[PDB]
Write a protein that binds this ligand. Structure first.
Ligand SMILES: Nc1ncnc2c1ncn2[C@H]1O[C@@H](COP(=O)(O)OP(=O)(O)O)[C@H](O)[C@@H]1O
Ligand code: ALF
Ligand SMILES: [Cl-]
Ligand SMILES: [Mg+2]
Length: 410
């Protein structure tokens, strides 16, 4: 960011600031379970308001609505309520992000107005592909032109979304496009932590986003010495390598095609892969599912999903943590939100905290994965908790993030 415009250098007095933030907070029963991401944007929002901004217009995605409006399930209205108490100022929530009324509402606001727009991904044009459909070029441009109308200057503080070349992150057309203080803070910490990692350097890759994150491993394999592939990531690997019965467990069809290549590469680079060997199983995807056990040998019965690892998996995971002097962890190794399926991420968290206390550099990142830290009160018991998960895995790969690359130059 050493040659991008940042917010400390952007005169905002009398200007309308349009700001990309990652307010993609975890939700349950329609309430926010962790305001980490909203809090982390506050310093940039306060700075703008403290420095004479006419308005701050805030925009984000929440979830993966895939280009269909879904106020029911993926509305940002709750974030607007939480943002009020953290700023101690009112937030005008708007029920759309583009179009004549959003434009009217943001055209010339009272001085100091903060406005939050609705979920960008209710419009196919943010990503723009969705549902199955490709966005139309003319309409992407139109959607991008609408968003650009809402401020005089642009700030991108959406670190957690920086890996995404979506319309709101890279397509806003204003003379001045500044990185915010959170983007700044996360990029510096990682440029430090990734410069000369302590070794063995372990990556711990779990979660639910298999299609996307399975595609990151190839470049990661050039950087790390060990890799835990757990959570929802494990089942593509285990079907291919062990012909394991997997049931309704998460599976990536594309990912499975390259699994043999990534294992060949892991070997060629001396990167030790630790995959799970037992499981807690579910009869459906529900907190109060009937539950069971399987090993890789037994397989998982048709009709059932693996939603946590078992105790023998926890033991292997612990051994990898014990050998590490640096850890980057994105993705829980089970569905930690539900207690029937939380023991394995809780045990792995326990290892990671014990590892930190004897000098291991521990870095946990992501919306859901940082919520592990909140839930077990380990936020100050590891080295760094980042608002980015995927964004951080893409910095580990050695990429310039598209949301950083689209910023103005000095
Ligand atoms: N089979 C499964 N299905 C759903 N979630 C699973 C899972 N296995 C583990 N998880 C856990 O993964 C969590 C999603 O994590 P992600 O968004 O991929 O990574 P990030 O938020 O960047 O750190 C989800 O909440 C569940 O607890
Ligand atoms: F859900 Al992520 F980084 F993939 F927070
Ligand atoms: Cl995905
Ligand atoms: Mg997540």
């Amino acid at each position: 960011l050493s040659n991008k415009l940042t917010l400390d250098k952007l005169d905002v007095k009398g200007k309308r600031v349009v700001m990309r933030v990652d307010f993609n907070v975890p939700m349950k029963n329609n309430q926010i379970t962790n305001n980490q991401r909203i809090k982390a944007a506050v310093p940039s929002i306060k700075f703008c308001l403290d420095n004479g901004a006419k308005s701050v217009v805030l925009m984000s995605h929440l979830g993966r609505p895939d280009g269909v409006p879904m106020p029911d399930k993926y509305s940002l209205e709750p974030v607007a309520v939480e943002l009020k108490s953290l700023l101690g100022k009112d937030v005008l929530f708007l029920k759309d992000c583009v179009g004549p009324e959003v434009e009217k509402a943001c055209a010339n606001p009272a001085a100091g107005s903060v406005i939050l727009l609705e979920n960008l991904r209710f419009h196919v044009e943010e990503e723009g592909k969705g549902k199955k459909v490709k966005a139309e070029p003319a309409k992407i441009e139109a959607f991008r032109a609408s968003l650009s109308k809402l401020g005089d200057v642009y700030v991108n503080d959406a670190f957690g979304t920086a890996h995404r070349a979506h319309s709101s992150m890279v397509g806003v057309n204003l003379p001045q496009k500044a990185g915010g203080f959170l983007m700044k803070k996360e990029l510096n910490y990682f440029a430090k932590a990734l410069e000369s990692p302590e070794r063995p350097f372990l990556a711990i890759l779990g979660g639910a986003k298999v299609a996307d994150k399975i595609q990151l491993i190839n470049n990661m394999l050039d950087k790390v010495n060990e890799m835990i592939i757990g959570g929802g990531m494990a089942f593509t690997f285990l079907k291919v390598l062990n012909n394991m019965e997997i049931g309704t467990s998460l599976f990536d069809e594309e990912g499975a095609k390259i699994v043999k290549d990534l294992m060949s590469k892991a070997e060629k680079n001396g990167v030790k892969i630790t995959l799970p060997v037992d499981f807690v199983t579910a009869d459906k995807f529900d907190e109060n599912a009937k539950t069971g056990q399987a090993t890789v040998a037994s397989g998982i019965p048709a009709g059932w999903m693996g939603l946590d690892c078992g105790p023998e998996s926890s033991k292997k995971y612990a051994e990898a943590v014990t050998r590490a002097k640096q850890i980057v962890w994105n993705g829980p190794v089970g569905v930690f939100e539900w207690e029937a399926f939380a023991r394995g991420t809780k045990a792995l968290m326990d290892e990671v905290v014990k590892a930190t206390s004897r000098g291991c550099i521990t870095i946990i990142g992501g919306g859901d994965t940082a919520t592990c830290c909140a839930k077990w009160n380990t936020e100050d018991k590891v080295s760094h908790v980042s608002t980015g998960g995927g964004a951080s895995l893409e910095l580990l790969e050695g990429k310039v993030l598209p949301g950083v690359d689209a910023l103005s130059n000095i």
